[PDB]
Amino acid sequence: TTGRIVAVIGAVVDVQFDEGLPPILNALEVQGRETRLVLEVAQHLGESTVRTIAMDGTEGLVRGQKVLDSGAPIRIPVGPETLGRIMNVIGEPIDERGPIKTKQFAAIHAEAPEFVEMSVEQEILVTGIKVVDLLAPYAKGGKIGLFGGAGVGKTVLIMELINNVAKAHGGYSVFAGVGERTREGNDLYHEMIESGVINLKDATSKVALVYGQMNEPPGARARVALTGLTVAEYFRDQEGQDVLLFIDNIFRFTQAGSEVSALLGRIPSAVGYQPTLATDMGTMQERITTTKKGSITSVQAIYVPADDLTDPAPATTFAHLDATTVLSRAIAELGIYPAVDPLDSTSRIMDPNIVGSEHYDVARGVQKILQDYKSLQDIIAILGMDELSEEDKLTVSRARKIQRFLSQPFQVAEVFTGHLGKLVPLKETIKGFQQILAGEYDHLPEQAFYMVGPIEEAVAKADKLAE
Amino acid sequence: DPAPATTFAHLDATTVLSRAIAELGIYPAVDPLDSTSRIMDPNIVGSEHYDVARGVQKILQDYKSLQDIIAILGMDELSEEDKLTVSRARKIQRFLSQPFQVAEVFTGHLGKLVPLKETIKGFQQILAGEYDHLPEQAFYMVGPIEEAVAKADKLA
């Protein structure tokens, strides 16, 4: 059936249908455009008029322009043929390499896996990143979140994880560029051609790419996460496979919705957000999961507006994760990278019955000395260092060294650090911190521990700093 | 506040008055670190005028950074270098104050007008350490630097 545009205000388009009314979520096709313009049905307004959000710019649209119901939600190509390819929100290839010749398509809207489909298996996923591995380790098939304000290190950290984990991963990866920088998509694309995880010449590609960046209007950024997710969902079920899912940045899904919320006639909730913020996030996040049929390891970069972790968006995201890495501008300001707050990062598998009591005891030991040093900071900062107990100033020196030993040169960060990147195996991370806690390096200066890999490099650097 | 905030960009010179400065008795209550001029440029006012100004502003900013320490612990916990910045800055703050003809009822002093060259010289001299021997109060509510000196002598 054919409908007619009746109103255009920004991304929001009202369309009147005289015959059959397309159900909410349906994809409509705008007639008379150069490039395919999809509108997604959001509301039935009454009087045979639906309200839609556009998946591309609405410039050029005329009241009365014809619109066709496709009969279904937005359906995208899914399967092996998406590997090596770049799609947009609506499953069109954006890599100028022609058609995506899949056998099947999948709607980007779908029901969340039921409770009975849940898995409880959790084994550690080592990253080679000291602070993560020690204090708040990732699990295979788990939900990982990287929280951070603007410019604190989410993307560098996620690129390091793709470098350390995805490169050598056996199964398939999905990366969804969601409301982020096009420059970063081009960067990542050519780094993966270089490293061979994407092959443009044969069929060995292990990564599918889905992009809807900050050059796109909100309707596109609001759905493009769903698009990536759906690709991953296919590889999880219709192949039963071990899938890695990377999303930078999942906040941009929620921000997109806030951009159109008022035009959809919503009373704003707190902090300017849609009232539906949490349910919207719910029906989306509950699809990003491991089930009995297959395993998704999801890593999601999560923007923190105005640096405030209580902001409804990141605040509501926390409950959806099994491991949280929280990045801090205060720490990054110090030159400590990755800028992980070791007193605000958590993991479900941080449990002596899972990681063993050795891993656990050192982790809790590290946090205690950092918390104790923190509880002395503001105090001695004005009351004098010499007025301290001989075991207080021993924790102050040890915590200052542990703070530094948590920092690490990233392979991905070589253009920022000037240091060659280091990957530190788990046992070496445990050992190193275990040793600093026991007093083994009180003779070594602070700076020896700054920006190094394993503990032997802190020793090597200590010799080099002498002369 | 949107109203004042939006006005700044319409100005070639801003004089920002401060209630905190006024409450300290400093009149005119000018915030010497929040008032700016588009002609405060060595090529327009000359390098001497420019240098003394930047100098005064630096010593006032250095003083400001020390004030958290001062408020809790006091003068006595400062290095000798800091005590000197504090004493010079506090004398500079006072020499920025001036009796207005228009406000004679409130000051209890005769209104004063200081020629530019003499303004530059007075502060040039305080910065050079030339009156580190004189008391603070001597710099308060006077015109030219000579009046500060004569006020110090009168404090017997």
Binding site: G384, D386 | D76
Partner: peptide, 22 residues
């Protein structure tokens, strides 16, 4: 004077006047 500070102008006062004790 002594090793311990945070006691007003005790330490500075003798130093202005000035092998030492403290």
């Amino acid at each position: 004077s002594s090793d311990r500070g945070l006691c007003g102008a005790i330490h500075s006062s003798v130093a202005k006047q000035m092998i030492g004790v403290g």
